Amino acid sequence: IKAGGEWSPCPPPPPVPQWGAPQLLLECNDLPP
Amino acid sequence: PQPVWEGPLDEDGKPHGLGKMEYPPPKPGDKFEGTMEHGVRTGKGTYTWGVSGAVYTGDYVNGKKHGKGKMVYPDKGVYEGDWVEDVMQGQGTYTYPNGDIYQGAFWAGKRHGKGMYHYKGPCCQLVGDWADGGFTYGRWVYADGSMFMGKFGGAAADSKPTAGSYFYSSSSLVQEGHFAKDGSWVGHRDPAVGKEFSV
Amino acid sequence: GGPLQQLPYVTPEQIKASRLLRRYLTGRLDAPVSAFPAFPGNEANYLRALI
Amino acid sequence: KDRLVKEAQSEQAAKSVALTRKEAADALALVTAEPRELLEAAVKLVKQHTAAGAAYAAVPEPLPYSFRVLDEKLPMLYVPNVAAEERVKFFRKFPKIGSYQACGVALPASGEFKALLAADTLFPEGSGQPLSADDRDFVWEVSQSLSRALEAVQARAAEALAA
Amino acid sequence: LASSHSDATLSSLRNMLSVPQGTYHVVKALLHLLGRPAASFSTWKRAHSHFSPRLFEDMAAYDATAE
Structure with missing residues (x-):
């Protein structure tokens, strides 16, 4: 056992975000023929 | 550069049937196929984007995504579930590029409701109340049975545990406590033998 | 004396994962070190990384 | 005397739960019914x-x-x-x-092998913790009783078909 | 004459763990003829539920005149 003064239980990995940027949202183009 | 339509055409040049439409590129342009009505789409359709490469094969209402649907984003992340007003809402499932799976409720395009997130690297699962794509309360379960019940920080705190109780199945000990700012675990009493947190 | 096993080699992943956890050695060479933080191996790999 | 009595009552309760569990496991073999039942x-x-x-x-x-x-x-x-x-x-x-x-x-x-009994503890509908040896022994005993019952079922069905 | 032995036939059919191949084929055909949803007797496991006393009564009830 390392006898340093520092240790703490590990937090869970951060859930990964969505494709939206910090937001852009892709939209179907609506133009008639 | 009017977009080309191939399929049945109603009066006034309004598409009215099962056909395919291709749009002019500004990198190919987009392409829709499926039922259309009076210039707007309705029913089970498939829209393939040009620049990004996303493909949405799902229902349509009033020219917007609505009802059950399934999308493959530019990143290999695949969503599958309910849509309202071309925004992810209601119950569904999401598969991330990392392999992490999420089952639960969405609201305004984020994780929100009662859901479970399963990581790929470590088999740990987060189960409970999500808000704004973050974990608020519930049970964080390891791959063997050891777990932690309590309140997790929001999206601001990156879903870190803040207060609650640890249970370790290797030794079968239960300890209740909280986390300091530095991350050090501070317990309120000495550990005691117990059992898993089955709500 | 007695039997004498040979520890396998050590990879950078095992060394990096060992710096995160803090365990008492059970004394036998086939024992799960931890579920989280995840460790890539059994007791022998943890012992090799500690060494 | 109080400490001794408490220990004795705990032992008696453990023996009672073991006996009732084994008694239930013994009953399934006796049942005569359709295989799915x-x-x-x-x-x-x-x-x-x-x-x-x-x-x-x-x-x-x-x-x-x-x-x-x-x-x-x-x-x-x-x-x-x-x-x-x-x-x-x-x-x-x-x-x-x-x-x-x-x-x-x-x-x-x-x-x-005709059937297979699978019991598991999976989160969140289950404990998520390894089965204790008593639980595994009960599953084994229940499966053995089911084996005897299924043998009886096949015997009766063959007799009826040949009747 | 089919419904004469309905109870014995149902009992012998229900006690079978395995799949009696030819008999399963004729039972599946008969279930198609009686206009069942046809997605509920694909495998023998699901076809187990369909046969019961009511099966023999339905056989007489089904119209033999309809085209």
């Missing part, structure tokens, strides 16, 4: 007495781990951690945390 009765007995989260019987893509029972002709299988194993199959297609156990139903005077 005998399987359903076993599932109920396993769920009530054991701490198992769910009990279900049953009558490239990795080979499901339950096929090990048929291929290696081994009567009982126990996976303490499904996370460690890779041949385990999840019905709802979502990865689960917990243990698993499956002890097949082998008819006596033969070796053909």
